RNA sequence: CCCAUGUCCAGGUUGAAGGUGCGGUAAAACGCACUGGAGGACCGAACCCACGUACGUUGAAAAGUGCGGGGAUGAGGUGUG
RNA sequence: GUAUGAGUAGCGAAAGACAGGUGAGAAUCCUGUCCACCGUAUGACUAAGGUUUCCUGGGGAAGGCUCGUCCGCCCAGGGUUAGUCGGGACCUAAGCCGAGGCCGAUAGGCGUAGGCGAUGGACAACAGGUUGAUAUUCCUGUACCAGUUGUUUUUGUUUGAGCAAUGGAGGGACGCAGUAGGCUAAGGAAUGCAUGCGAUUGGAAGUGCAUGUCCAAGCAAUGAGUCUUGAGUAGAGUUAAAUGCUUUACUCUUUAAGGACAAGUUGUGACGGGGAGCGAAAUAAUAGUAGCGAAGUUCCUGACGUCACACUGCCAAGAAAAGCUUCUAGUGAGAAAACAACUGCCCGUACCGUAAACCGACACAGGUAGUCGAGGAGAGUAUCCUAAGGUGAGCGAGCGAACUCUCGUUAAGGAACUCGGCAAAAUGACCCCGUAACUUCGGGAGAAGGGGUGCUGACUUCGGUCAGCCGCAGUGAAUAGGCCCAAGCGACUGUUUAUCAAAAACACAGGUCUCUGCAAAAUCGUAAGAUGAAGUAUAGGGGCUGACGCCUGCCCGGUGCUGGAA
RNA sequence: UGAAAUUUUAGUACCUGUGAAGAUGCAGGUUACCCGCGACAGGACGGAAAGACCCCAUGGAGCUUUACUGUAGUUUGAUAU
């Protein structure tokens, strides 16, 4: 659920957070861990390529089976766990052959619940089926785009796709963001929503807590100098003395679309919202 | 009042060293200019 | 290198004489040398059975004569401690 | 500014959630105590910073000293690479 | 090059005085006695950096802001000893290089394998002495790690003991805060104990004065205690195998038992060494130096040092790799222990190190990582005075003018000064009482405002309390808030023009709009390639606003954008 | 013991006036033995600095844009692969 801290201090005033009711352990598995270098927006060349990042708490990477290659071998849930690299929670599963693994803990999942994959699999949460073998109307998550690449699309919190039809070799899929799309039918997906629908509600209350979340400060270009941003400069406080407010480069900020108009997937996209 | 030269043998030789200069191409020019000049301290 | 060019000379000093009176002798050595080579060298040069060998390498000592300044050469000084039931090297 | 790896923050204080018990209830909201020990919380050394003032202003100093000053478990200070 | 200013400013924060000595010459050097300064340091370790500044013996040409017989200066000599300390012959992070390869006017850029690379991980020693200068290094004892040869005792010889992988597994292996608790440094130096001595200034041979009031590493045993349920069937899998590892069901046990882990304690080590002090000639012992050597208890306090990230809680969810253990695959006729002996490389090791040796042009009032850092009073590393120990500031003497600076008092008044209460003054610790408007019910609040505080006896059930005494005054000194009323700005903690602006400026949580379906969008770059992301619309990027509350009206004609289409 | 800035030479008075228009130095008149010490700071249009205000230069640099001319990118099409 959500915690609502009392207002002892002006930082803690209107803060909220999660009580982490759905988590059974703070004790992850020593095998599925890998390290993370925080890049802080820097790149191969050391230059800032993505602003407003870096400087927070250390993290590890938790190897997750988005692919679900393993078929006709069940897997029983033991624990739900915090993953800092994402918004959602995760879950530990032992395959009966003894393989340990993490997966993306869907909504309505509980310890002891048992999961499978393949066409013979059943229409229940946590089970990874190809879009061939999934009926219309069902909510899914952990969708992939190319077979064997692994789940790409529906992996974050409180997200929910929905099958809506087919066209032969493809499947028609509504996504979060309202976009309808044709997706290759042999792509695997898992049933249900993704997990903690309450993460959207968390107020943060502290700049320092944003820092812990690795988010540097955003500086506005209406205050920078003219060399620094196209909105910079001006005596006193300046409006946007331009048409089409812009990025630090010449890209407009509002309205200008950025999808390549040569995109091969435009034939697949049926109805887009964004 | 802290100052600009906080010495360090390691940083000095890792930046301004023979290995570094001879590794880069444009350090080959520097060293060869110490010699044409006729330096006793090539690095 | 060769065992006799390993060793160069002894070090006649007060400390070294005080060590001679405790049965361990100082020797200047090739700067590229090794402790086991000093051992082999003395054992072949005196038929004395060596017990232990210490080594120092001395920095070059600044000097000057008029306008011109420079450095004394580097040195390596071994200290060869002998056994009992052994001879005492005569210098 | 950032990456990794380490390290430092005397002492004292206040007393959030949660929990327990006793009331009260048809049972609860609720209340009273105790526990607990949170905080970009408080006072204040080192540490960090530089608000004012005087002095210095061919300075002890190519930006300081003194008298006070602000922060001081964090968005902290600092070291090495 | 030499004048001018001018023999002027300055001689760089602070306490020295005296007697003797050395010497041509003494405020300045040496010895000594008093005195003062530091003491969470102005002390003792030590990384970096410096790189010979260290020690001895001479010197006073220059340097030292004076002098100088002296020095971190000059001259001649010497000085740094490691199987165990730190680093390499061990491991790897960030980052770097990079076979081949990819990309590219050239040059080259990127990057895989594989390497490098500590600030981390792993890794076998410590007590004393000793030099003029080195000390876990040298010396004496006592060990420990890896290895070699030999002797002795065992057992394996190919249905084969043992070694055993780069292969499989485990382990290594980790955050922040918060208290309890145990143990031990440490301290009181309270107590006893040992040694020495009765003070001439009025008193004291006693509950007088002073000083001290120990010892490893290793071996053995023990252990405050702390973690962890563990055994067994049917199995599936562990790129092939496996007695090892993982796990699905199933039974029994779970205050338990078993298995690990442990600070520390005791006995040895130790018939040794240290140690108050006493104290040798033949004297460069021109001694306090060889040398000799007592006792080393009890009680109280008591550590975030350690057990130990052990436990609890929390969210921001907290390196890896190798050593190490096991498994077999493989290999295999030699291996295990006891004893004796032997071997163990390379670099650093001096000295400075909150500084006159580093960085600042200087022997510069600046800055310089970490460890130890005692006592009384005290919560305390604050503060005052002291301990161990270390210093006495590299110009002085006198006279005690104006004026400048740093300080201290002040009649009466009390902000009349002033741009302005600037500066200074006043308050300041602890205990108790008491404490408003307003409020996001948390606060405001240490509000305000008051009172008390010393000493000596009784008294408690240990803090209150009573009585008495003294002073102008009792946190008697030092160290510690001035407060209140109201208004504007910004909500807040924070950041900001290194060197004239600390702010109402920036950020901030929050809000909104917009883009983006994943080879994203955006960005760096010729491109490869990379960030974004080892993320995936509750995610990310960009613009604006800026906590919270009530709100956020009308305008799409214009300029843009989006979509459309004859 | 031992500098520095500055410095055309200097035996370097005052009033009034003159004068590149505000004189230690020219004039007329007046006052004033020579040399110093400590203090002050009215002047030497004092020192420091080729005015930063202003104007000029067919000077420069940064910045803006519905100034000009271009261009990297973005996009559309033709053609080749
Ligand atoms: K290290
Ligand atoms: K103290
Ligand atoms: K319009
Ligand atoms: K004047
Ligand atoms: K211009
Ligand atoms: Mg601005
Ligand atoms: Mg612009
Ligand atoms: Mg305006
Ligand atoms: Mg503008
Ligand atoms: Mg050595
Ligand atoms: Mg605070
Ligand atoms: Mg404070
Ligand atoms: Mg510091
Ligand atoms: Mg300022
Ligand atoms: Mg003068
Ligand atoms: Mg001085
Ligand atoms: Mg102090
Ligand atoms: Mg000396
Ligand atoms: Mg002199
Ligand atoms: Mg000398
Ligand atoms: Mg490269
Ligand atoms: Mg690598
Ligand atoms: Mg008497
Ligand atoms: Mg030393
Ligand atoms: Mg001095
Ligand atoms: Mg008065
Ligand atoms: Mg007035
Ligand atoms: Mg004031
Ligand atoms: Mg007081
Ligand atoms: Mg007004
Ligand atoms: Mg503010
Ligand atoms: Mg502030
Ligand atoms: Mg400033
Ligand atoms: Mg704003
Ligand atoms: Mg004029
Ligand atoms: Mg005139
Ligand atoms: Mg004339
Ligand atoms: Mg004079
Ligand atoms: Mg002038
Ligand atoms: Mg000019």
Numbering used by the authors:
A (entry chain G): 2 to 275
B (entry chain 6): 1 to 43
C (entry chain W): 1 to 91
Reproduce text from the manuscript describing this model.
LsaA–E. faecalis 70S samples were further analysed with a custom tRNA microarray, which confirmed tRNAfMet was the dominant species found in the sample. Further examination of the LsaA-70S volume revealed weak density in the ribosomal A-site, suggesting that some complexes had entered the elongation cycle. One class, containing approximately one-third of the particles, was shown to indeed contain a tRNA in the A-site. For LsaA, the side chain of Phe257 overlapped with the binding sites of tiamulin, virginiamycin M and lincomycin, but was not close to erythromycin, consistent with the spectrum of antibiotic resistance conferred by this protein. When LsaA Phe257, which directly overlaps the PLSA-binding site, was mutated to alanine, no change in resistance was observed. Taken together, these observations indicate that LsaA does not confer resistance via simple steric occlusion, and that interactions with the P-loop may be required for positioning the LsaA ARD. Additionally, in the LsaA-bound 70S, U2504 was shifted such that it directly overlaps with the PLSA-binding site.
One class of such proteins are the antibiotic resistance (ARE) ATP-binding cassette (ABC) proteins of the F-subtype (ARE-ABCFs), which are widely distributed throughout Gram-positive bacteria and bind the ribosome to alleviate translational inhibition from antibiotics that target the large ribosomal subunit. Here, we present single-particle cryo-EM structures of ARE-ABCF-ribosome complexes from three Gram-positive pathogens: Enterococcus faecalis LsaA, Staphylococcus haemolyticus VgaALC and Listeria monocytogenes VgaL. In each instance, the globular NBDs of the ARE-ABCF were bound in the E-site, and the α-helical interdomain linker, consisting of two α-helices (α1 and α2) and the ARD loop, extended towards the PTC. Our structures and mutagenesis experiments support an indirect mechanism of ARE-ABCF action, in which a conformational selection in the PTC, elicited by ARE binding to the ribosome, leads to antibiotic egress, and hint at a rationalization for the specificity of LsaA, VgaALC and VgaL for PLSA antibiotics.
